[PDB]
User: Which sequence fits this backbone?
């Protein structure tokens, strides 16, 4: 079978249909890997983001800080300042831990959120193409829709065409989980 990407408008929910997909392959004995950001809300206020891994590790990602002055480069998204190293802490090996054997096993690689970072995106382009090099690993992720300008990281995947493109709605939002798994497990069990 082939890679699968979500698309549509942002509005939060698809995140958890991927999370459910990250229980189900597991319940089918397919040890999925990769990372997912979650909304770091210490007692319910947005203070930054993290980068969880399916191994239960979670990174920094962004935290509160001043905007970058016109001399000192930093990576502000609105209020918080991200860092590429905050990803590299964990969102770097998880793309492609090991290789050998081939045949039965394959791999699955979760990458929710490939859309916000389209300017800061640096090690993404690299690490993601090392993942797309692997024949076993099954890219599974969330890009935005193409409207106007090409996102300078979604381009690296857009290249393929072959990836399934699941346009979510807010209507049938919670339906898409099995519809993705259908495409994934279309690889010979």
Assistant:
């Amino acid at each position: 079978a082939r890679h699968v990407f979500l698309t549509g408008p942002p509005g939060v929910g698809k995140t958890t249909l991927i999370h459910k997909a990250s229980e189900v392959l597991k319940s089918s004995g397919v040890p999925v890997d990769g990372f997912y950001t979650e909304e770091v809300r210490q007692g319910g206020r947005r203070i930054g983001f993290d980068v969880v891994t399916l191994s239960g590790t979670r990174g920094p990602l962004s935290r509160v800080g001043l905007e970058p002055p016109p001399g000192k480069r930093e990576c502000r998204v609105g209020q918080y300042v991200v860092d590429l190293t905050s990803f590299e802490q964990l969102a770097l090996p998880v793309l492609r831990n090991a290789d050998c054997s081939s045949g039965p096993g394959q791999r699955v690689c979760v990458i929710d959120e490939i859309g916000k970072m389209e300017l800061f995106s640096q090690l993404f382009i690299q690490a993601v193409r090392q993942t797309l090099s692997t024949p076993g690993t099954i890219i599974l992720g969330t890009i935005p829709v193409p409207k106007g300008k090409p996102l300078a990281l979604v381009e690296e995947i857009r290249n393929r065409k072959d990836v399934k493109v699941f346009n979510v709605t807010k209507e049938n939002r919670n339906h898409l989980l099995p519809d993705i798994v259908t495409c994934v497990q279309s690889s010979r069990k």
